[PDB]
Amino acid sequence: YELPWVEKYRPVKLNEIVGNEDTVSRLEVFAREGNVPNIIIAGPPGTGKTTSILCLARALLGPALKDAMLELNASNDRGIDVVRNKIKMFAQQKVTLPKGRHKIIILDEADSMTDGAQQALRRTMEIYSKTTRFALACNASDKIIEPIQSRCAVLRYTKLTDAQILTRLMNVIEKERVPYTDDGLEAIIFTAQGDMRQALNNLQSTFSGFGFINSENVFKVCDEPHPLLVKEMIQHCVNANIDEAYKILAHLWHLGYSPEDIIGNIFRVCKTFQMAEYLKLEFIKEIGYTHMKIAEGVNSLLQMAGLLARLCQKTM
Amino acid sequence: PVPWVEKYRPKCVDEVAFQEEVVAVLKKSLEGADLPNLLFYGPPGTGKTSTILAAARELFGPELFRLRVLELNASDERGIQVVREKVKNFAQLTVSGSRSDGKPCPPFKIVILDEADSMTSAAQAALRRTMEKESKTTRFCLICNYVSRIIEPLTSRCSKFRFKPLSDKIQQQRLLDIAKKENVKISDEGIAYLVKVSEGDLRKAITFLQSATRLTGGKEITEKVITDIAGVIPAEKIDGVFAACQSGSFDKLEAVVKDLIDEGHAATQLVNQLHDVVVENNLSDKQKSIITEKLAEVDKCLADGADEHLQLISLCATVMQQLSQ
Amino acid sequence: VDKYRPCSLGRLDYHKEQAAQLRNLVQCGDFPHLLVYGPSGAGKKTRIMCILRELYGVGVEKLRIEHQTITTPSKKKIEISTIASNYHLEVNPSDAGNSDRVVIQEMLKTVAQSQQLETNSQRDFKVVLLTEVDKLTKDAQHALRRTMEKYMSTCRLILCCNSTSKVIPPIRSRCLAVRVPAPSIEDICHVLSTVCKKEGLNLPSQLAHRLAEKSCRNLRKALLMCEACRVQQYPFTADQEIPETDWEVYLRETANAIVSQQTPQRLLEVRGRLYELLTHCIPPEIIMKGLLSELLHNCDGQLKGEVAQMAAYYEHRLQLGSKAIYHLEAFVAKFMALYKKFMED
Amino acid sequence: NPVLRRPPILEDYVHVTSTEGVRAYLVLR
Amino acid sequence: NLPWVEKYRPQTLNDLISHQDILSTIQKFINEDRLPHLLLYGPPGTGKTSTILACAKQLYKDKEFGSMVLELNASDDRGIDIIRGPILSFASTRTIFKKGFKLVILDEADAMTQDAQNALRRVIEKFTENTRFCLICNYLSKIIPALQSRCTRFRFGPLTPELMVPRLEHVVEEEKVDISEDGMKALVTLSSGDMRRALNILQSTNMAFGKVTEETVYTCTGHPLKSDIANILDWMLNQDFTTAYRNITELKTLKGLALHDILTEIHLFVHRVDFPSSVRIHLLTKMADIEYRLSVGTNEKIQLSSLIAAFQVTRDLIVAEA
């Protein structure tokens, strides 16, 4: 009954968080200032928006965490009745706390609520501001209304950078004593696509599967279109060649891949290709046009062949 | 409520002319009482829907026609959920094969899918899965324009029945028979032009003759009412367009394009009739190729929703570029 | 233009044979679903009015305004201003940007499953007059086709539209297509002479011909121009300053500013002018049409043809996106690059 | 190279003419 | 009696083929009681449901299979009421049976929305030690990366014909029907690497005619013939425009072909025809455009004429290069 590495090696203090730089320093200042405002934390999913406010609350309250901390996810019911009852009930309780300490009501996924829930959340945040401090973890901050974010601080989280994911992955590798190769690290970066929990889950999956880290073992348990072949397809499209590129496309089509998977790996390789800048921008525009065709409902091999022909036609 | 395309459906399978081989195979399949495989396909107006309805009437009778026959339009119901719920709701009703008139009725309910080739591959995969759900109590019959649009698994559990297009002599014969039956005054040239504007379609010809009887109101049906109900652009306009593009400047092109637009003529009819003219005459292969590719792009832009006048002036610019060189 | 509209098909001035066909259609039973189309201002609403007059008694001219409340899939009550009567119901479903399918389902249900009150006066069916069906989405027109299939018995529709290429063929094939052309210059001059002579005016034939040629065969524009020319100066001369609409001459000045200079600061100024045109709520199709006409009036050396193709292409792009200013500025930027290339060499 | 006027006698081929009819052939291999 | 797929469904980890690394890893995880939430994704009919049913009948007996396995499929709509309905209440309960985890087989998991997949992500992460989910789907890219980041995925690829033909030989030895070489080539080509359609086509060819040859499969299925598309390409490449248009429209109204199937078979044909690169690029761009123009729902004769137009420009360029 071993725990997965997603929750086993979650950090327990703000010094171990590698994602942001200014926001984690703001949280470190807030953890000792004791006058924490209501905050809204915005960013992509999986960048650590709820293992940061959790670490702030655990460093703030400390031993009184179990009585003066309420995490409300979207796992439970997301109606107006539960937010009316449970949040007000928890805010009305008393906890014997120090001078610079307040209760914390984390609201994970605060963007799925309606306008009535947030316009009542205005008054719940305004009235009980002495007793408790709110922390709304939102996926998109534009869906948060202006009077909510006027009275509360806004904190921004970016997508994990590949150097930060490299540092975290090598820390986990040194912790678990995993033998590794640099090609396997590049493969787990490529299959990670910037998400930290995805990176840790793929690393623990290939460690439980095969053990030693190499670039061939990563794609046996994930089985994306191989970036060597997709990079060869892009290189053949940029070198004025259509027959060899369609040979690679038919090789990756008789392995049964969907058009969406191949064109997603095509764009992910063409992000980090090496060519001219204007050629990159024209290629990304053509790939986006073809992906609009495919997501519209045209998912034939002929559309991928036409994409290859258009990419070969852009480069003279 | 007089739907002449439904009123003149032959309700008996012996009344179905020109298709006596398919009629005989259908009669053998009905008398065999074990029919897992059924499919009808062909051009529109060939009466495949009327043939399968005549088979359902000669087997089930009028009493079970409203009970065990369910007709669904696939193009009207392209969503997954509706054809999941309605087919299952009809199939879950257990109705025995006992008839009050004493005729032996085999125990199945028949399902008609009109225009089943309009579905995508995933919709037909879910449809097949529903076929494997209910392959016992009810039976299915798909009607499509082309058999090659139907995905493989639905061709496994069906037997194809191809339909030839009806020859124009029996088209004119049926049109004059219906006009004599309903006392419609129309000459042989009017019948010939009516079957000309409705290219291989008896449904369109029947609806256009019904509309001609509505719009004339007892008068003799002329060529103008026929060419106006179908929306057919007259050949004088096409000849003027090609005369402007052959020897003229863009003032002449804008004049004829503004004349066609302010006459109210649709751009889809213009691209269709200009394609019909430009695919038969004595232009070069390169000129016909460039003009037809431009016509296809223009009809795509009109299907997207682009403004028709700009498409027509660009099309006439392309035709002028190819012709006046 | 509203006081002296002909009330019946026998009082029409042009398109007599189509009036005869439509009154023969009314003269018998089973009146089918109509699809009335043509160019704008041709007289489609006049023909549909005369059809509704012939379809019933004299009470068709009674009209009333209702504000019906629709509910979307989201819990949102939206008001729709319907022009209704006791014999028909005229609606514009294009005002709902995404809830057009809901209103054309609900109005069809409340007009079909709610039976008629006094079936002795009207017939067994009542008419729903959809207006401007071309800008409806494809799934909305599919829902319209489904509701037309379900309720053929008590609700037979008349669809007034223009440029039928936006309308899907599965709903076009079920409807009798009636095409009302724009009247000819001689017929516009004849109805101008009639509308002048029945109010004591002395309009000459030359000014009437100039009004007909200037209005681009739009009859409502060619009659409001006549009334504005009466108000502007009553003694009618052959050389009169015809009152021009402001956005048309603004588009002409816009094209003059385009052909004046091919610098990106002039592109910023013309972006401001295009933004003024857009914020004046005129559609970008009419803007592209007027811009192309005024640029082809000021072009030479066959370049017009290439420009013509260019205009259509960007209008196509304007029908795929939502922000029309990107496509309009792309069109004028490509046109200014092409002129600079043409005038430089 | 990809267009041959003479027929290939060891593989399949597809004929291709024009308005004048020179009758070239294309390899199906 | 019964269809052949429901008769000869595999019931053993060795009876499923070409997934030997996946089945070996599943057996390795299930002998050591370390099986995670599974996400089996791939083409239809490649052995997704039968693999996890074999693993369920390995784990559980016949008596407790109906109790500790809940199956949801395409008959159940997959929105937000289901994830807060039966599957949550199933996963959040214990059983009076032996101390093992439950199992939920969710067929067609790619049809769930992003909100539904996030709610399922909450349910999966909340209950792990007592419930092991199994989401099987066609497209991996239609689900969110968080759901991919919490459940172990496995790619059930297509079956290579070299490995596909022993099972077809076994089912043609067990069921005595007429077998030829071209019939087996038609089976392994038209079936497109999945055993379900191969067995269905084989049974339909047996029941319809009696013998299995190439033309019997082609007449029972309606697939476009190779000589048919060869005639279409010959008419496009060495005939006049009106002649080719009339010939191909008569063949379309006779053979029952459609322009999409003509387009994909011609696309498969033009990579065998040794064109120069530039006219290959022109043909591919034009044919992809015709495919999109047919996708948006236009008239068919004009797109047919555009296909002939592209091939007539092609034939002019080929003769001019000769």
Ligand SMILES: Nc1ncnc2c1ncn2[C@@H]1O[C@H](COP(=O)(O)OP(=O)(O)OP(O)(O)=S)[C@@H](O)[C@H]1O
């Ligand atoms: N900067 C980081 N440093 C260390 N671990 C991180 C970091 N960012 C993410 N993680 C890990 O990724 C997971 C964080 O997931 P969550 O924070 O729960 O998701 P989220 O980003 O908050 O988005 P929500 O809450 O679903 S809207 C944990 O397993 C963390 O260990």
Ligand SMILES: Nc1ncnc2c1ncn2[C@@H]1O[C@H](COP(=O)(O)OP(=O)(O)OP(O)(O)=S)[C@@H](O)[C@H]1O
């Ligand atoms: N063999 C036939 N014998 C007699 N009448 C026929 C025959 N075939 C067609 N018809 C007539 O043609 C009419 C049209 O029949 P339909 O079933 O609507 O044609 P269709 O093939 O179903 O085209 P659709 O419905 O648009 S796909 C029928 O009502 C008959 O009057």
Ligand SMILES: Nc1ncnc2c1ncn2[C@@H]1O[C@H](COP(=O)(O)OP(=O)(O)OP(O)(O)=S)[C@@H](O)[C@H]1O
């Ligand atoms: N590896 C295999 N070996 C032998 N027969 C197989 C194999 N895979 C599939 N089959 C056959 O094909 C049928 C379909 O298999 P299933 O796994 O039920 O379909 P599926 O893989 O789940 O794909 P779906 O359900 O259509 S999305 C089985 O019942 C077998 O008859």
Ligand SMILES: Nc1ncnc2c1ncn2[C@@H]1O[C@H](COP(=O)(O)OP(=O)(O)O)[C@@H](O)[C@H]1O
């Ligand atoms: N027979 C006629 N006699 C007088 N005026 C007419 C006649 N037919 C049309 N008109 C005028 O032409 C104008 C066209 O308006 P309308 O019918 O709304 O066109 P559209 O429906 O295309 O916008 C109306 O203002 C009407 O007064």
Ligand SMILES: [Mg+2]
């Ligand atoms: Mg989180």
Ligand SMILES: [Mg+2]
């Ligand atoms: Mg039909």
Ligand SMILES: [Mg+2]
């Ligand atoms: Mg399944």
